[PDB]
C-alpha cells in the first residue's frame, strides 16, 4: 500500500532507468546481421565475419546501432513480421500473448528506434490489437468475483495483467464496502508475513 | 434437523418412548403412523418437507401425544426473524452458544472458546451461529448413545441413599464429556431417562451422583450431584455441603474450583475413601 | 501451439443483391494489384470448378461483408457462387457454359472459428468453421443426381427436372420419382447421357491424439466431400477442412424426435504436414550443379561424413546407409523380365551401439519410410491380409506394411525376435519385389518394390568373439 | 480514492432528526447546531445523526427525495432517457445505505426504497460501460459525462484512466 | 384454459419479485442483493446462468417453493422466463455488439437429505428428487432443436416459431396443410439448437444391499451442464424423474432423470513459500525420502531412488526434433514377500497420475468386436497414464504378447500396432515401477535393479525384534502431491560443465574393466555398461537437482547417484551370473 515500485516507461520514448520491468524486458534476444568484423571477441559466437546472423539482447543493440548501419543491421522477429500481422487482425481475442512474450507491447514499442521501413505498420498493429482485446478485459475483470481467475489471466502479458489486477482491486473493494466490511482496521503488511 | 432425528434425541421423548429398547421403538412408528406422516418425509430435513403436511403440525403432534401419555408437549417461547431466510427459536441460539463454548477439541488456553462464543451473538456473525448448530447436533447424537449405554448395561448402582454411576474410557465418545461443565447436562438427562425407565418405587426418588475421569496424568475424576428428580422439583441442590464435609472427614485431596459447589475434582484413589464416608454422612 | 492459420504464420518467408454486387466488385481486383484476375484466368487455363479465396483480403477490402460471411455462410455462399459465374462469363462465355455451376473454397485466418471436433459446439450452426484433425474412415464414392433430362417419343418434346436435397445450400427435399407420364397421354423415357450427376463421399474427422485430455474417447465429426474434392483424403492423415456447419433433420412416420445430426459440408481441404520436397530454387539448383562439379574425387565420402553427425564411429555403416538412400537402377528387359534395384542392409551387434538410432534417422531422412518391430509384426501383417467390410460384407485384401512402403524404406528393428514362421513370409517380397496371395476367396499380386533396413541382436545376448560369425 | 472516503465525503449531507435530550447551541468549526429541544426537529450533518442514533439518543427522518412514489418515477425516467439523468442528491447510494442500515425502522417501506435505489444504480452503471467502450472503440479524446455522481466515477475510474493512458502512448509512438 | 394463463401471469410475477428483492446479510453490517448482482455479473461475462437456492425461495414465499417440488416441469418455465425479464432491466443498455437478450438457464441447488436410486418408487414421477451416485459413462454432445419451423411441400405454406418441449420428447407433425397427407418438412436453415449430453449414474458402492450388481439410472444434461463431469466423479443430482415420450409387458415405459442441478465432491502465493523454503533448506534431500514409506522400514536406498521417479528429468528437443526421455524405470527384484505391494500402493496413491496393475491388458490389443464383427483397437493402461506412473508386480505373469509390447513401449515410448484393420500410434508417457520375483535385454530395458537380502546375527535379530512391533502396532502426502505439481512445472535443470568431466571419467573407467571381465570368464550372461544407462544417470541427476529448484546441477549429487547405481548394477550382477 506504500511500496510504490518504479513503473515502466517501455511504451514511451525510452525505458526508465530503475524500473525492474524494463530491465527484464530488454534482456530478450533479437536477430542482427553484422556489418564489419568483430575482432578480439569472437569467443562468444578471434574475430567474427561481416554478414553473419547473430542473436543479441535488445540493450546491446541500442548503442551498437547507428543510422548508417555502421556495425550491424537488424531484422524483426517473426511475431512482428507480416505473417502474424494478419493473424492479429483476424480476431485478436484468440492469441496467447503470454507465449508470444511475455512482453508484447513493451518490446514492440522499442523496435521503433531502429528506423526500419515498416514502422508505420507496426505502430498500427499494436494500436489495433490493444483496441481489439479491450472489451474482454474490461468485462472479465470487473465481473469475476470470488472465482479462480487463474484461467481468465493465462493468456495476457505484463501490460494487460497490470489492468486485470486493477479491475479486481476495485471490484473487491466495492463489494467489501457494500457488506459493511471496510470499516474494521486491519494489519497491512504483517499479514503478508503470516 | 429432520423431524425424525429430533424425536429420537430430545431427552423428553427419548425417555417416554424408551427409544433405546427395540421393544418400544415401534412406539415411535405408531406415533408417526397415527398422524399420516410418510416415513419418507419424516426422515428428510424439515425445510424441505412438503408444504401440505406442515400446515397444522404443531397441533396434530400435541393431540396424538395425549394418546401416549405426554401432555406437556407445547411450551411458551419466543422467536426472531431477521430477513428472508433467518428464523430462530430462542432455544436454538441457546444450544448453539452452549456448544461453541464447550467444544471438545481444545485449541489453546481456557479463554479461546469463550471468545468465539461471545462472538456468535451479534447478527454480524451468522456464520458462527450457523456453525455452532453443527456442534450442538453432534453433541445431541452423542448423548443418547451414552444414556443408551448406562441403561442397556445397568451401570446405575443403588448405593444407598443416592444412586451412583461411572464411565469407561474405552466407550466411544466419552472424552467429549471430560469438561466439568458439559457433565452436568449429561447427568441431568440421565436422571430423566432413568426415573422413567426403572420399575422400582424407591429409585424413582433418589438423587444421582456421577463421576467421570478428568485427568489421566494426575489420575483424577470429576464428580457432580443433582437433586432428586420429579415433575415439580423445587431445584434446591444440597451436595455442596455433603462433598465438603466428606472430604473433611476422610481428609483426602479435593478441589472446589468452580463457582457452583457441587462439582469437584478428586484423586482416583480417594474415590472409595470419599464415597464411604459420604454414604455414612448423608445416611 | 495454436494453428490460427492454414499458412503457418511463423515462417511464411523462408436483400441478396448487396452481397452479390459486393462480391463482384471484390472479384474485379484489377485496379489495386490484380490478384484475382490473375487467378480466374489461371484456373480457366486449367479447367477447374472452384477457386480458393483469402478472407484476409475480404477484411481489408470490406469488413462488413467479411463478418457477414463467417456467420451466415449459406445465404452468402449462394451469392458468392453466383457472382462468380457472372465474373467468369465476363471473360469467356464459351467456358462459362461448359460447367453447370462453379464453386468457391475459402482459406485465410478466421478469428474464433479455428476449432477442433471437441470444441465444435452448437453455437457454430450455419457458420464457416475450420476443423483440424485425423481422418479415420472413408465412404464409397457414389453419384448423386442434380438434374434429369427426359424425352417424349410420341410428342417429340423434351422436358427437364431440377433436383435438390438436404445436402445443398438451399435445402428443399425433392422426390426422385423420375416422371414417366407427365400428362397421362404421352409416355416418357429418361436420357442418361444428357443428365447431370456428381460425386459424393463421407469421411470422419477425429480429434488428434496428443490434443485429447486423455480421459475419454476423443470426439469425431462427419464431413461430406463433393464435386472433385472427393478422393482428397485417405485414412490416417492430418487434414484442415474448411466447411460450413449444418444440422440435417429427419422424420420417421410424421413424428420427429428433436435430436438432429450435424455435419460439415466441406469446401476446402489441406494436408497439414508437408511430405514432399520438389520445391527447389534456381539458386538451389545452381548450388547443386556447383557442388556436383567441384570435386568428383571426394564427394561421396564428403556426403557420408555429414550423414549422421550425432553418432561417432561407424563410417562404413554410414557409407552403406547412404548407398541405400540412393538406390540402384531397376532394369526390365524386353521380354518382360525384371531385376531389382534396391539394397537391403542388416546390422547385428551388442546392445547400445546406436543401431536404433541409425534406424530412427533413416526413417526421417527418406520420404515414405515405415517403421516396424520384431514382435509387433506378424508374417501376414507385414505383406497383406484378407478381411471383409462392415457395410458390404465381402472380402478384400488389406495391404500390409511392406506394400504401403512402395518405392520407399522399411525399418525393422529387433529382426531376431521374429519367429521362424514369420521370416519366411518375406523371401518373395525382398527379392522378386511383389507379393502373391492365394487365400480362400482372394487371388492377387501386389507391387511391393521396396528396400529393407534391419537390425538384429546376436544370439547369446552378446557377440562371443571366439565362436564364429555363423553361430 | 476508495469507497471508504467517498463515504467520508458523503457524511456532510444534511438530515433532520428529532432529539430526546437537552442541549444548547454548539459552535462547530463547520458551522452552528442546535439548540436541541426534546421532541422537536433539527437539521444536522449525517456523521452526527448516525452517531447519535447508535447511542439511542434521537430518531431519524426520511429525506424528502426518499419517497416510494417519486422514486418509482425516477426509475422509469432513467430507463427511458439515453444519457445520465440528474439524481436527487449527489450521494444517494451512501445515503440510502447508511440510513437504511441504521434507521430502517424509522423509515416506512425501507425494503422498497432500497430496491428502487438499486434499480437506478444498476442502470446508471450499464450506461457507463457503453459510454466507456465507444470511447476506446472510436479512439476519442474527450467525453462529457453529464450527471455522474462521485461513486459511479470511483467504481470504475482507476481502471478506465489507466487503460486510456496506455492507449495514448500506443497512439503517439511514431511522431519522432 | 383461460384461467391457466391468468395464473401464470401471476406466478411469473411472483417469481420475478423474488429475484428482484431477496437480500442477505444483517442490518448491523450491511446488505447484499444476492441474485440481481449474480445475474449482472454473469451476463456481462457472457455466462447466462444463475444458481437459485431452494431454501431462499422457500423463506421468501412459501407457496412457490412447494409448487416447484410438486410440478417442477411447468414452473421451471415461469422461473426461467422471469430470470430473462430481470436480466433485461439490470444490464441494459447493452453496449454495441449485443442487443438481443439471451436466455438464462436457471439451475438450482439445495441443502436437503439425498434419496437413493433404490428409493425411486413410481409415486415420485415428475417430482424433484435429489440422488447421489457416480458417473459411469458420458455420451458425446449433440444438438437438440428447441424452436423449430416447418414448411409445406406442395403449396409452400409455412407455420413457424413452433417450440419443442424440453426433455426427451419429440413432436407430432401435422397432416392437414390448409396438398397430400403429410406435406410438412423441416427447414434446416431455421431451427435454433442447443447442446445436450446423456450420462449414466451408478449408485454409491456402500448402499448396495449386497447380493448383486449395483443398479444405475440415466440422466439428460443440457446447455451449460454439458461437459461438466467426467466418468469417475462423485456427484449429487437434482432432477425431474420423468418418462420418455417417443410415442416384456403391455404398458411399460422408460424412465430418466432430467438433470437441472449438479454438484461435485472433492496453488496459492503463500503456499508457494512452504515449497520455496523447503527446497532451500540445507537437508532438503532426506526429509522427503524419510516420509515416503512410513510402514515399511529398512534400506532407504530403495526409498531414496523412488523420490526421483516422482519428479523426473526434463524433456529436451535437439535441433533434429530427436526428443529425449523424461522419465525413469525401476526394478525391485527379490522374493515376493508382500513387503513390496505396500510400496506399490503407496507410490500409486501419492502420485499425480498413477495406476497399479497386476482386463484389456497393458499395451494396446486388437479384438474382434461382436457388433462390428471386425477388429478394433484397445489402448490399455500405458496410453491412459499421461506423464503418470504405472506399477507392476510379478513380471513373469503378464501375457507373452503383452510382455513383448511393454518391452517395445519402454524402448520407444509409443505403441504402434499394424494389424488386421488397425494402423495407429499411441504415445505412452508414463513411468514403470516394476517388482520382480528374464533375458539380459528386457532386464537391460531398465536402469536400476534392487534385489532383497537379510542376515541372522542376534544383534541383527534385535533389529528384527524392533521391526516386529513396527508392524504389530498397525511433510504430508496431501501437500507432497501439490508440491510436486509445482516443482515439475517450474524447473529446467541441465548439467554444468564440471558434471560432464565427472561422468566421462566415471563411465570410461566403468567400461575399461568390463573387457578383462568378459574376455576371460564369459559366463554366458553378465551385464556391461551402455550409453542408455549413462543417459539414465544424467536424467537421475536432473531429478535430484530438481528437488531444490536448482536450475544448474553440480557435483553435489553425481557421485552419490553413481554409488546408488553401483548398488543397482551390482545387484543384477549378482543375480545374472
Ligand atoms: Zn400445402
Curated annotation (Swiss-Prot), chain A:
It is found in: Nucleus; Chromosome. Transmembrane segments: none annotated. One of its GO terms (cellular component) is CMG complex. Residues 1-14 are annotated as: Not essential for folding and stability of GINS complex, but may regulate accessibility to the central complex pore. SUPFAM superfamilies: GINS helical bundle-like, PriA/YqbF domain. GO terms for biological process: cellular senescence; mitotic DNA replication initiation; multicellular organism growth. Keywords: Chromosome, DNA replication, Nucleus. Required for correct functioning of the GINS complex, a complex that plays an essential role in the initiation of DNA replication, and progression of DNA replication forks. GINS complex is a core component of CDC45-MCM-GINS (CMG) helicase, the molecular machine that unwinds template DNA during replication, and around which the replisome is built. Component of the GINS complex which is a heterotetramer of GINS1, GINS2, GINS3 and GINS4. Forms a stable subcomplex with GINS2. GINS complex interacts with DNA primase in vitro. Component of the CMG helicase complex, a hexameric ring of related MCM2-7 subunits stabilized by CDC45 and the tetrameric GINS complex. Belongs to the GINS3/PSF3 family. This is DNA replication complex GINS protein PSF3. It comes from Homo sapiens. The gene is GINS3.
UniProtKB/Swiss-Prot annotation, chain B:
One of its GO terms (molecular function) is single-stranded DNA binding. Changing residue 15 to V: In MGORS7; decreased protein level. GO terms for cellular component: centrosome; ciliary basal body; CMG complex; DNA replication preinitiation complex; nucleoplasm; nucleus. It comes from the Eukaryota. Widely expressed, highest levels are found in adult testis and thymus and in fetal liver. It is found in: Nucleus; Chromosome. Keywords: Cell cycle, Chromosome, Disease variant, DNA replication, Dwarfism, Nucleus, Phosphoprotein. The keyword Nucleus applies. Its main location: nucleus. GO terms for biological process: DNA replication checkpoint signaling; DNA replication initiation; double-strand break repair via break-induced replication; mitotic DNA replication preinitiation complex assembly. Changing residue 180 to L: In MGORS7; likely pathogenic. Belongs to the CDC45 family. Component of the CMG helicase complex, a hexameric ring of related MCM2-7 subunits stabilized by CDC45 and the tetrameric GINS complex. Associated with ORC2. Interacts with HELB. Required for initiation of chromosomal DNA replication. Core component of CDC45-MCM-GINS (CMG) helicase, the molecular machine that unwinds template DNA during replication, and around which the replisome is built. This is Cell division control protein 45 homolog. It comes from Homo sapiens.
Curated annotation (Swiss-Prot), chain C:
It is found in: Nucleus; Chromosome. It catalyses: ATP + H2O = ADP + phosphate + H(+). The modification N6-acetyllysine is found at residue 297. GO terms for biological process: DNA replication initiation; DNA strand elongation involved in DNA replication; double-strand break repair via break-induced replication; mitotic DNA replication initiation; regulation of DNA-templated DNA replication initiation. Residues 299-471 form the MCM domain. GO terms for cellular component: alpha DNA polymerase:primase complex; chromosome, telomeric region; CMG complex; MCM complex; membrane; nucleoplasm; nucleus; perinuclear region of cytoplasm. Coiled coil: none annotated. One of its GO terms (molecular function) is helicase activity. Acetylated by MCM3AP. O-glycosylated (O-GlcNAcylated), in a cell cycle-dependent manner. Its EC number is 3.6.4.12. ADP binds at residues 357, 397-399, 401. It is an enzyme of class 3 (hydrolase). The keyword ATP-binding applies. The modification Phosphoserine is found at residues 164, 279. Keywords: Acetylation, ATP-binding, Cell cycle, Chromosome, DNA replication, DNA-binding, Glycoprotein, Helicase, Hydrolase, Nucleotide-binding, Nucleus, Phosphoprotein. The keyword Hydrolase applies. Its main location: nucleus. Component of the MCM2-7 complex. The complex forms a toroidal hexameric ring with the proposed subunit order MCM2-MCM6-MCM4-MCM7-MCM3-MCM5. Component of the CMG helicase complex, a hexameric ring of related MCM2-7 subunits stabilized by CDC45 and the tetrameric GINS complex. Associated with the replication-specific DNA polymerase alpha. Interacts with MCMBP. Interacts with ANKRD17. Interacts with MCM3AP isoform MCM3AP; this interaction leads to MCM3 acetylation. The gene is MCM3.
From Swiss-Prot, chain E:
The keyword ATP-binding applies. GO terms for cellular component: chromosome, telomeric region; CMG complex; MCM complex; membrane; nucleoplasm; nucleus. The modification N6-acetyllysine is found at residues 345, 349. Residues 284-469 form the MCM domain. Its main location: nucleus. It is an enzyme of class 3 (hydrolase). The keyword Nucleus applies. ADP binds at residue 324. Its EC number is 3.6.4.12. It catalyses: ATP + H2O = ADP + phosphate + H(+). Belongs to the MCM family. It is linked to Meier-Gorlin syndrome 8: A form of Meier-Gorlin syndrome, a syndrome characterized by bilateral microtia, aplasia/hypoplasia of the patellae, and severe intrauterine and postnatal growth retardation with short stature and poor weight gain. Additional clinical findings include anomalies of cranial sutures, microcephaly, apparently low-set and simple ears, microstomia, full lips, highly arched or cleft palate, micrognathia, genitourinary tract anomalies, and various skeletal anomalies. Component of the MCM2-7 complex. The complex forms a toroidal hexameric ring with the proposed subunit order MCM2-MCM6-MCM4-MCM7-MCM3-MCM5. Component of the CMG helicase complex, a hexameric ring of related MCM2-7 subunits stabilized by CDC45 and the tetrameric GINS complex. Interacts with ANKRD17. Interacts with MCMBP. Interacts with TONSL; the interaction is direct. This is DNA replication licensing factor MCM5. The lineage of its organism: Eukaryota, Metazoa, Chordata, Craniata, Vertebrata.
Amino acid at each position: 500500500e506504500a511500496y510504490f515500485r518504479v513503473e515502466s516507461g517501455a511504451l514511451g520514448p525510452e525505458e526508465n532507468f530503475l524500473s525492474l520491468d524494463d530491465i527484464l524486458m530488454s534482456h530478450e534476444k533479437l536477430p542482427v546481421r553484422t556489418e564489419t568484423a568483430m575482432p578480439r571477441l569472437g569467443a562468444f559466437f578471434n574475430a567474427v565475419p561481416q554478414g553473419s546472423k547473430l542473436e543479441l539482447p535488445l540493450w546491446l543493440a541500442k548503442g551498437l546501432f547507428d543510422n548508417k548501419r555502421r556495425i550491424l543491421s537488424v531484422e524483426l522477429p517473426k511475431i512482428y513480421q507480416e505473417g502474424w500481422r494478419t493473424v492479429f487482425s483476424a480476431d485478436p481475442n484468440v492469441v496467447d500473448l503470454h507465449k508470444m512474450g511475455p512482453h508484447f507491447y513493451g518490446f514492440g514499442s522499442q523496435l521503433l528506434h531502429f528506423d526500419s521501413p515498416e514502422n508505420a505498420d507496426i505502430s498500427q498493429s499494436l494500436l489495433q490489437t490493444f483496441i481489439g482485446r479491450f472489451r474482454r478485459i474490461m468485462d472479465s475483470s470487473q465481473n469475476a468475483y470470488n472465482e479462480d481467475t487463474s484461467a481468465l489471466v493465462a493468456r495476457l502479458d505484463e501490460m494487460e495483467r497490470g489492468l486485470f489486477q486493477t479491475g479486481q482491486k476495485g471490484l473487491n473493494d466495492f463489494q467489501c464496502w457494500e457488506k459493511g466490511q471496510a470499516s474494521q482496521i486491519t494489519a497491512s503488511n504483517l499479514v503478508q508475513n503470516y | 434437523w429432520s423431524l425424525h432425528d429430533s424425536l429420537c434425541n430430545t431427552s423428553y421423548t427419548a425417555a417416554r418412548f424408551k427409544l433405546w429398547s427395540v421393544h418400544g421403538q415401534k412406539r415411535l412408528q405408531e406415533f408417526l403412523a397415527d398422524m399420516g406422516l410418510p416415513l419418507k418425509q419424516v426422515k428428510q430435513k424439515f425445510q424441505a418437507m412438503d408444504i401440505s403436511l406442515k400446515e397444522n403440525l404443531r397441533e396434530m403432534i400435541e393431540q396424538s401425544a395425549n394418546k401416549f401419555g405426554m401432555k406437556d408437549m407445547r411450551v411458551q417461547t419466543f422467536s426472531i426473524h431477521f430477513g428472508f431466510k433467518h428464523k430462530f427459536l430462542a432455544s436454538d441460539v441457546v444450544f448453539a452458544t452452549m456448544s461453541l463454548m464447550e467444544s471438545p477439541e481444545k485449541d489453546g488456553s481456557g479463554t479461546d472458546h469463550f471468545i468465539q462464543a461471545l462472538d456468535s451473538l451479534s447478527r454480524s456473525n451468522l456464520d458462527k451461529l450457523y456453525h455452532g448448530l453443527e456442534l450442538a447436533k453432534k453433541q445431541l447424537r452423542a448423548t443418547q448413545q451414552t444414556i443408551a449405554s448406562c441403561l442397556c448395561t445397568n451401570l446405575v448402582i443403588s448405593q444407598g441413599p443416592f444412586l451412583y454411576c461411572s464411565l469407561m474410557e474405552g466407550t466411544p465418545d466419552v472424552m467429549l464429556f471430560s469438561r466439568p461443565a458439559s457433565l452436568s447436562l449429561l447427568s441431568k438427562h440421565l436422571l430423566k431417562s432413568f426415573v422413567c425407565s426403572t420399575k422400582n418405587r424407591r429409585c424413582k426418588l433418589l438423587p444421582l451422583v456421577m463421576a467421570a475421569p478428568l485427568s489421566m496424568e494426575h489420575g483424577t475424576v470429576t464428580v457432580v450431584g443433582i437433586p432428586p428428580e420429579t415433575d415439580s422439583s423445587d431445584r434446591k441442590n444440597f451436595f455442596g455441603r455433603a462433598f465438603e464435609k466428606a472430604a473433611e472427614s476422610t481428609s483426602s485431596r479435593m478441589l472446589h474450583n468452580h463457582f457452583d459447589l457441587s462439582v469437584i475434582e478428586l484423586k482416583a484413589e480417594d474415590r472409595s475413601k470419599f464415597l464411604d464416608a459420604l454414604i455414612s454422612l448423608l445416611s | 501451439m495454436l494453428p490460427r492459420s492454414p499458412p503457418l504464420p511463423r515462417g511464411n518467408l523462408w436483400e441478396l443483391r448487396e452481397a452479390q454486387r459486393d462480391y463482384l466488385d471484390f472479384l474485379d481486383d484489377e485496379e489495386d494489384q490484380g490478384i484475382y484476375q490473375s487467378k480466374v484466368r489461371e484456373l480457366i487455363s486449367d479447367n477447374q470448378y472452384r477457386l480458393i479465396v483469402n478472407v484476409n483480403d475480404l477484411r481489408r477490402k470490406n469488413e462488413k461483408r467479411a463478418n457477414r460471411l463467417l456467420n451466415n455462410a449459406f445465404e452468402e455462399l449462394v451469392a458468392f457462387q453466383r457472382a462468380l459465374k457472372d465474373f467468369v462469363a465476363s471473360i469467356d462465355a464459351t467456358y462459362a457454359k461448359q460447367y453447370e455451376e462453379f464453386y468457391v473454397g475459402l482459406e485465410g485466418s478466421f478469428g474464433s472459428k479455428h476449432v477442433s471436433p471437441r470444441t465444435l459446439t452448437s453455437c457454430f450452426l450455419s457458420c464457416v468453421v475450420c476443423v483440424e484433425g485425423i481422418v479415420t474412415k472413408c465412404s464409397l464414392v457414389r453419384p448423386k443426381v442434380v438434374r434429369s433430362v427426359h424425352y417424349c417419343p410420341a410428342t417429340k418434346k423434351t422436358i427437364e427436372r431440377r433436383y435438390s436435397d438436404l445436402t445443398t445450400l438451399v435445402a428443399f427435399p425433392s422426390s426422385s420419382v423420375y416422371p414417366t407420364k407427365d400428362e397421362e397421354n404421352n409416355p416418357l423415357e429418361t436420357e442418361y447421357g444428357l443428365s447431370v450427376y456428381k460425386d459424393h463421399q463421407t469421411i470422419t474427422i477425429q480429434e488428434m491424439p496428443e490434443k485429447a485430455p486423455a480421459g475419454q474417447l476423443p470426439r469425431s465429426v462427419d464431413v461430406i466431400l463433393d464435386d472433385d474434392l472427393v478422393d482428397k483424403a485417405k485414412p490416417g492423415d492430418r487434414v484442415q477442412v474448411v466447411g460450413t456447419y449444418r444440422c440435417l433433420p429427419g422424420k420417421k412416420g410424421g413424428y420427429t424426435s428433436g435430436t438432429f445430426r450435424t455435419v460439415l459440408i466441406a469446401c476446402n481441404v489441406k494436408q497439414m504436414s508437408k511430405d514432399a520436397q520438389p520445391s527447389f530454387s534456381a539458386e538451389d539448383i545452381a548450388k547443386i550443379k556447383k557442388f556436383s562439379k567441384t570435386r568428383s574425387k571426394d564427394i561421396f565420402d564428403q556426403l557420408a561424413k555429414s550423414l549422421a553427425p550425432s553418432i561417432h564411429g561407424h563410417d562404413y555403416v554410414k557409407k552403406a546407409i547412404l548407398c541405400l538412400l540412393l538406390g540402384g537402377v531397376e532394369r526390365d528387359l524386353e521380354n518382360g523380365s525384371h531385376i531389382r534395384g534396391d539394397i537391403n542392409i542388416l546390422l547385428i551387434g551388442d546392445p547400445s551401439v546406436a543401431k536404433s538410432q541409425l534406424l530412427r534417422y533413416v526413417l526421417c531422412t527418406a520420404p515414405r519410410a515405415i517403421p516396424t518391430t520384431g514382435r509387433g509384426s506378424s508374417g501376414v501383417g507385414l505383406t497383406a491380409a484378407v478381411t471383409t467390410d462392415q457395410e458390404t460384407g465381402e472380402r478384400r485384401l488389406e495391404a500390409g506394411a511392406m506394400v504401403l512402403a512402395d518405392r520407399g524404406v522399411v525399418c525393422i528393428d529387433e529382426f531376431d525376435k521374429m519367429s521362424d514362421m514369420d521370416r519366411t513370409a518375406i523371401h518373395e517380397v525382398m527379392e522378386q519385389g511383389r507379393v502373391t496371395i492365394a487365400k480362400a476367396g482372394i487371388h492377387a499380386r501386389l507391387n511391393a518394390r521396396c528396400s529393407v533396413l534391419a537390425a538384429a541382436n546376436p544370439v547369446y545376448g552378446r557377440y562371443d568373439q571366439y565362436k564364429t560369425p555363423m553361430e | 480514492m476508495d469507497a471508504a472516503e467517498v463515504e467520508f465525503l458523503a457524511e456532510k449531507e444534511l438530515v433532520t432528526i428529532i432529539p430526546n435530550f437537552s442541549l444548547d447551541k454548539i459552535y462547530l468549526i463547520g458551522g452552528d447546531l442546535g439548540p436541541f429541544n426534546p421532541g422537536l426537529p433539527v437539521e444536522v450533518p449525517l456523521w452526527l445523526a448516525i452517531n447519535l442514533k447508535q447511542r439511542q439518543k434521537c430518531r431519524l427522518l426520511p429525506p424528502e427525495w426518499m419517497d416510494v412514489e417519486k422514486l418509482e418515477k425516477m426509475r422509469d425516467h432513467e430507463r427511458k432517457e439515453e444519457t445520465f439523468t440528474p439524481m436527487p442528491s449527489p450521494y444517494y447510494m451512501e445515503l440510502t445505505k447508511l440510513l437504511l442500515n441504521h434507521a430502517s425502522d424509522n423509515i416506512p417501506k425501507a425494503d422498497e426504497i432500497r430496491t428502487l435505489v438499486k434499480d437506478m444504480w444498476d442502470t446508471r452503471i450499464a450506461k457507463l460501460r457503453v459510454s466507456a467502450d465507444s470511447f476506446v472503440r472510436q479512439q476519442e479524446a474527450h467525453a462529457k459525462l453529464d450527471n455522474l455522481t462521485l461513486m459511479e466515477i470511483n467504481t470504475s475510474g482507476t481502471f478506465l484512466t489507466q487503460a486510456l493512458n496506455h492507449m495514448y502512448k500506443l497512439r503517439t509512438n511514431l511522431q519522432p | 384454459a383461460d384461467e391457466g394463463q391468468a395464473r401464470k401471469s401471476q406466478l411469473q410475477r411472483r417469481f420475478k419479485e423474488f429475484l428482484r428483492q431477496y437480500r442477505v446479510g444483517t442490518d448491523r453490517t450491511g446488505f447484499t442483493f444476492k441474485y440481481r448482482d449474480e445475474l449482472k455479473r454473469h451476463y456481462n461475462l457472457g455466462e447466462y446462468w444463475i444458481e437459485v437456492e431452494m431454501e431462499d425461495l422457500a423463506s421468501f414465499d412459501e407457496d412457490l417453493a412447494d409448487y416447484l417440488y410438486k410440478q417442477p416441469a411447468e414452473h421451471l418455465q415461469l422461473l426461467e422466463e422471469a430470470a430473462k425479464e430481470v436480466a433485461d432491466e439490470v444490464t441494459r443498455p447493452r453496449p454495441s455488439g449485443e442487443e438481443v437478450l439471451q436466455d438464462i438457464q436457471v439451475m438450482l441447488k439445495s441443502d436437503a437429505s439425498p434419496s437413493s436410486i433404490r428409493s425411486l418408487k413410481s409415486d415420485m414421477m415428475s417430482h424433484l428428487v435429489k440422488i447421489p451416485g457416480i458417473i459411469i459413462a458420458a455420451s458425446a454432445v449433440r444438438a437438440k432443436a428447441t424452436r423449430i419451423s416447418i414448411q409445406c411441400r406442395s403449396c409452400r405454406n409455412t407455420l413457424t416459431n413452433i417450440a419443442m418441449r424440453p426433455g426427451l420428447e419429440g413432436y407430432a407433425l401435422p397432416r392437414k396443410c390448409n396438398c397430400p397427407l403429410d406435406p410438412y418438412f423441416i427447414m434446416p436453415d431455421k431451427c435454433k439448437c442447443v447442446d445436450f449430453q446423456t450420462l449414466k449414474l451408478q449408485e454409491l458402492p456402500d448402499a448396495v444391499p449386497h447380493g448383486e450388481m449395483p443398479r444405475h439410472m440415466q440422466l439428460y444434461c443440457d446447455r451449460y451442464l454439458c461437459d461438466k463431469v467426467v466418468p469417475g466423479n462423485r456427484v449429487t443430482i437434482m432432477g425431474i424423474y420423468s418418462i420418455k415420450k417417443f410415442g416384456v409387458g403391455v404398458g411399460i415405459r422408460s424412465s430418466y432423470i432430467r438433470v437441472l442441478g449438479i454438484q461435485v465432491d472433492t496453488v496459492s502465493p503463500q503456499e508457494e513459500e512452504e515449497f520455496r523454503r523447503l527446497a532451500a533448506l540445507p537437508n532438503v534431500y532426506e526429509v522427503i525420502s524419510k516420509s515416503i514409506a512410513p510402514s515399511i522400514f529398512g534400506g532407504t536406498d530403495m526409498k531414496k531412488a523412488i523420490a526421483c521417479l516422482l519428479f523426473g528429468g526434463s524433456r529436451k528437443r535437439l535441433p533434429d526434433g530427436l526428443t529425449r526421455r523424461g522419465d525413469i524405470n525401476l526394478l525391485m527384484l527379490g522374493d515376493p514377500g508382500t513387503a513390496k505391494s505396500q510400496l506399490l500402493k503407496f507410490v500409486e496413491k501419492c502420485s499425480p497420475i498413477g495406476v497399479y496393475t497386476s482386463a484389456a491388458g497393458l499395451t494396446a490389443s486388437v479384438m474382434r468386436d461382436p457388433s462390428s464383427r471386425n477388429f478394433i483397437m484397445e489402448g490399455g493402461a500405458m496410453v491412459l497414464a499421461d506423464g503418470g506412473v504405472v506399477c507392476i508386480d510379478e513380471f513373469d505373469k503378464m501375457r507373452e504378447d503383452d510382455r513383448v509390447a511393454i518391452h517395445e513401449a519402454m524402448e520407444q515410448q509409443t505403441i504402434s500396432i499394424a494389424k488386421a484393420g488397425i494402423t495407429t500410434t499411441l504415445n505412452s508417457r508414463c513411468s514403470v515401477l516394476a517388482a520382480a520375483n528374464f533375458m539380459p535385454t528386457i532386464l537391460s530395458r531398465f536402469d536400476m535393479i534392487f534385489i532383497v537380502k537379510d542376515e541372522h546375527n542376534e544383534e541383527r535379530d534385535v533389529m528384527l525384534a524392533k521391526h516386529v512391533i513396527t508392524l504389530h502396532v498397525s511433510i504430508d502426502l496431501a501437500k507432497l502431491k501439490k508440491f510436486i505439481a509445482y516443482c515439475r512445472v517450474k524447473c529446467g535443470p541441465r548439467l554444468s560443465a564440471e558434471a560432464a568431466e565427472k561422468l566421462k571419467n566415471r563411465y570410461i573407467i566403468m567400461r575399461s574393466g568390463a573387457r578383462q571381465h568378459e574376455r576371460d570368464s564369459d559366463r554366458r550372461s553378465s551385464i556391461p555398461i551402455t550409453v542408455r544407462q549413462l543417459e539414465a544417470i544424467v536424467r537421475i541427476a536432473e531429478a535430484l537437482s530438481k528437488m531444490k529448484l536448482q536450475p544448474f546441477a553440480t557435483e553435489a549429487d553425481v557421485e552419490e547417484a553413481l554409488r546408488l547405481f553401483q548398488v543397482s548394477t551390482l545387484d543384477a550382477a549378482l543375480s545374472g551370473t
